[PDB]
Design a protein around this motif. Structure first.
Motif, PDB file in Angstrom:
ATOM      1  N   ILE B  59     -16.640  -2.078 -10.358  1.00  0.00           N
ATOM      2  CA  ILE B  59     -15.186  -2.016 -10.329  1.00  0.00           C
ATOM      3  C   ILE B  59     -14.832  -0.558 -10.102  1.00  0.00           C
ATOM      4  CG2 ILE B  59     -12.982  -2.596 -11.440  1.00  0.00           C
ATOM      5  CD1 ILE B  59     -14.504  -4.810 -12.883  1.00  0.00           C
ATOM      6  N   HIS B  79       7.308   6.905  -8.617  1.00  0.00           N
ATOM      7  CA  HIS B  79       5.933   6.725  -9.125  1.00  0.00           C
ATOM      8  C   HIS B  79       5.160   8.005  -9.516  1.00  0.00           C
ATOM      9  CE1 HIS B  79       7.004   3.172  -6.658  1.00  0.00           C
ATOM     10  NE2 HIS B  79       6.472   2.454  -7.631  1.00  0.00           N
ATOM     11  N   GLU B  80       4.292   7.779 -10.521  1.00  0.00           N
ATOM     12  CA  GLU B  80       3.387   8.899 -10.993  1.00  0.00           C
ATOM     13  C   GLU B  80       2.219   9.011 -10.012  1.00  0.00           C
ATOM     14  OE1 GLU B  80       3.531  11.271 -13.723  1.00  0.00           O
ATOM     15  OE2 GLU B  80       5.527  10.613 -13.238  1.00  0.00           O
ATOM     16  N   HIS B  81       1.741   7.897  -9.474  1.00  0.00           N
ATOM     17  CA  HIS B  81       0.650   7.923  -8.496  1.00  0.00           C
ATOM     18  C   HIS B  81       0.485   6.511  -7.999  1.00  0.00           C
ATOM     19  CE1 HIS B  81      -1.600   7.132 -12.441  1.00  0.00           C
ATOM     20  NE2 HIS B  81      -1.872   6.033 -11.733  1.00  0.00           N
ATOM     21  N   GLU B  83      -2.406   3.572  -7.630  1.00  0.00           N
ATOM     22  CA  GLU B  83      -3.775   3.183  -8.030  1.00  0.00           C
ATOM     23  C   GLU B  83      -4.153   1.866  -7.348  1.00  0.00           C
ATOM     24  OE1 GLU B  83      -2.803   2.799 -12.297  1.00  0.00           O
ATOM     25  OE2 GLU B  83      -4.904   2.595 -12.796  1.00  0.00           O
ATOM     26  N   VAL B  84      -5.384   1.699  -6.859  1.00  0.00           N
ATOM     27  CA  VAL B  84      -5.837   0.447  -6.194  1.00  0.00           C
ATOM     28  C   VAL B  84      -7.096   0.077  -7.031  1.00  0.00           C
ATOM     29  CG1 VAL B  84      -6.999  -0.481  -4.032  1.00  0.00           C
ATOM     30  CG2 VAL B  84      -4.889   0.647  -3.807  1.00  0.00           C
ATOM     31  N   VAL B  85      -7.214  -1.045  -7.629  1.00  0.00           N
ATOM     32  CA  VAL B  85      -8.347  -1.465  -8.493  1.00  0.00           C
ATOM     33  C   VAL B  85      -8.979  -2.717  -7.879  1.00  0.00           C
ATOM     34  CG1 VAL B  85      -9.233  -1.919 -10.768  1.00  0.00           C
ATOM     35  CG2 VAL B  85      -7.344  -0.389 -10.665  1.00  0.00           C
ATOM     36  N   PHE B  86     -10.278  -2.665  -7.608  1.00  0.00           N
ATOM     37  CA  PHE B  86     -10.957  -3.788  -6.955  1.00  0.00           C
ATOM     38  C   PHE B  86     -12.441  -3.843  -7.333  1.00  0.00           C
ATOM     39  CE2 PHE B  86     -13.287  -1.383  -3.555  1.00  0.00           C
ATOM     40  CZ  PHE B  86     -12.627  -0.143  -3.676  1.00  0.00           C
ATOM     41  N   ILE B  98      -9.068   1.603   2.549  1.00  0.00           N
ATOM     42  CA  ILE B  98      -7.911   1.359   1.728  1.00  0.00           C
ATOM     43  C   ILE B  98      -6.790   2.107   2.452  1.00  0.00           C
ATOM     44  CG2 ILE B  98      -6.739   1.978  -0.465  1.00  0.00           C
ATOM     45  CD1 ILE B  98     -10.278   0.829  -0.379  1.00  0.00           C
ATOM     46  N   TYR B 107       5.885   1.977  -2.141  1.00  0.00           N
ATOM     47  CA  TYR B 107       4.614   2.100  -1.455  1.00  0.00           C
ATOM     48  C   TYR B 107       4.047   0.708  -1.144  1.00  0.00           C
ATOM     49  CZ  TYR B 107       1.927   1.768  -5.874  1.00  0.00           C
ATOM     50  OH  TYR B 107       1.518   1.500  -7.120  1.00  0.00           O
ATOM     51  N   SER B 108       3.251   0.773  -0.056  1.00  0.00           N
ATOM     52  CA  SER B 108       2.561  -0.529   0.264  1.00  0.00           C
ATOM     53  C   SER B 108       1.103  -0.198   0.434  1.00  0.00           C
ATOM     54  CB  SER B 108       3.461  -1.194   1.275  1.00  0.00           C
ATOM     55  OG  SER B 108       3.046  -1.181   2.547  1.00  0.00           O
ATOM     56  N   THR B 109       0.211  -1.120   0.110  1.00  0.00           N
ATOM     57  CA  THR B 109      -1.277  -0.884   0.256  1.00  0.00           C
ATOM     58  C   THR B 109      -2.001  -2.145   0.747  1.00  0.00           C
ATOM     59  OG1 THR B 109      -3.317   0.086  -0.713  1.00  0.00           O
ATOM     60  CG2 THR B 109      -2.006  -1.319  -2.189  1.00  0.00           C
ATOM     61  N   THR B 110      -2.986  -2.000   1.604  1.00  0.00           N
ATOM     62  CA  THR B 110      -3.782  -3.103   2.106  1.00  0.00           C
ATOM     63  C   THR B 110      -5.246  -2.596   2.217  1.00  0.00           C
ATOM     64  OG1 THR B 110      -3.903  -4.913   3.837  1.00  0.00           O
ATOM     65  CG2 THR B 110      -3.318  -2.597   4.595  1.00  0.00           C
TER      66      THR B 110
END
Ligand SMILES: N[C@@H](Cc1ccc(Oc2ccc(O)c(I)c2)c(I)c1)C(=O)O
Ligand SMILES: N[C@@H](Cc1ccc(Oc2ccc(O)c(I)c2)c(I)c1)C(=O)O
Lengths: 116, 118, 116, 118
Positions: B59, B79-81, B83-86, B98, B107-110
């Motif tokens: 992880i 936002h403070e930052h 984070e992406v968790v996987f 990422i 923000y957007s994330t993929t």
């Protein structure tokens, strides 16, 4: 109602209901203490997490159990969960709507900060 | 490269340059341990974080310092930052990209996951 | 209220108000005929564009005047406007919420299709 | 390349392959005229649409056939297509990358504008 959560599903074009959400406040130690908790309604919404007396300035964490939601649908997700972290400062404490749109391999989030 | 990061700026329609990124691996004692660190280049890309050997099943947490970027521009972000968790490499080794698209209040994330060449 | 529009501003974390919106229906000719029109309220919302009798199956176009909105703010935008095009089919005609989140150089849009 | 298109799929975390794209230029009679056409590759990219010479100042429309892609996967999407409308090369020539991230009921789009090398 100083803090509200709205979650939508981008795959089906509908609210994301029965989505677990945990709120955290930064502690002295710099650890995270449990604060508020719920499950989104039929409208993908979560309210009355806190009150204007308990919601003071500080750092909060909003954790969305996205992986549980996709599993339930038979879909393998990328993310362990979606986290949102902000300072609840602004002017003084206010009216925060945290929204998240979800896809198996992506997520977007936005804050709407308004004072009535 | 098994792990690559791409950051874009939505206010200016350009890459997000000199954005700090920190990668962590969940430890055995269930603690986050520092794994790798870096800054986005001129093209809003971050390469060379790790090696195939080093990048085992686990992880991971990618923390992007979005707050410091917006401040540097004269903006006060929400936002403070980011984070992406996987979970990674759990059904054999893969390549991960990422990507993040940033705005002051959003923000957007993929992720793009690819099967190595053999 | 079969069709509603919600627009948010990603730069300021607030609704996007006084945003012009035009709705179009595909004609015989394959041209576009004016259908419904408004300006978003204080809550970035637009409702009562049409009625369940007038909203029949067919192709619609939703045009958001985003460039006007950024200009007003002294910000140079990328987009001429944001367009959304869909078939208002589904089952039969239903309850459509078209939402858009805006940035000078980007936009995201989603449809929430629910029947009460 | 003055105009480049990148399409990603958010349901699968991969590039959107063999996606059709049509580019139009607003004519003098205020009509949309066909300018260029193509399909995304293996990497979800579309290159070679036009040349610096050919790509003059004007209003362009990039239409992406998102509907045909989702149908091919067994999904019935909400949108008929994704269209991006912008003014180009109006303060000298630039390079444009239009990116789209696709979901069945949603899509996101951003542009990266760059100043050519001289
Ligand atoms: N309506 C609420 C908040 C809210 C939630 C989700 C939304 O849609 C989208 C549409 C596209 C996106 O990328 C995302 I993230 C959200 C929108 I627009 C607004 C309020 O104003 O009080
Ligand atoms: N070049 C990179 C990936 C990368 C970066 C930004 C993008 O645009 C968008 C357009 C919308 C979004 O919400 C997001 I997050 C990105 C896209 I599509 C792809 C690669 O090959 O891996």
């Amino acid at each position: 109602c100083p803090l509200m959560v709205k979650v939508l599903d981008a795959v089906r074009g509908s609210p994301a209901i029965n989505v677990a959400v945990h709120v955290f406040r930064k502690a002295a130690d710099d650890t995270w203490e449990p604060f508020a908790s719920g499950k989104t309604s039929e409208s993908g919404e979560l309210h009355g997490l806190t009150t204007e007396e308990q919601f003071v300035e500080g750092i909060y964490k909003v954790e969305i159990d996205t992986k549980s939601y996709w599993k339930a649908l038979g879909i393998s997700p990328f993310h362990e969960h979606a986290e949102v972290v902000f300072t609840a400062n602004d002017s003084g404490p206010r009216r925060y709507t945290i929204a998240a749109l979800l896809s198996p391999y992506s997520y977007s989030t936005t804050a709407v900060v308004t004072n009535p």
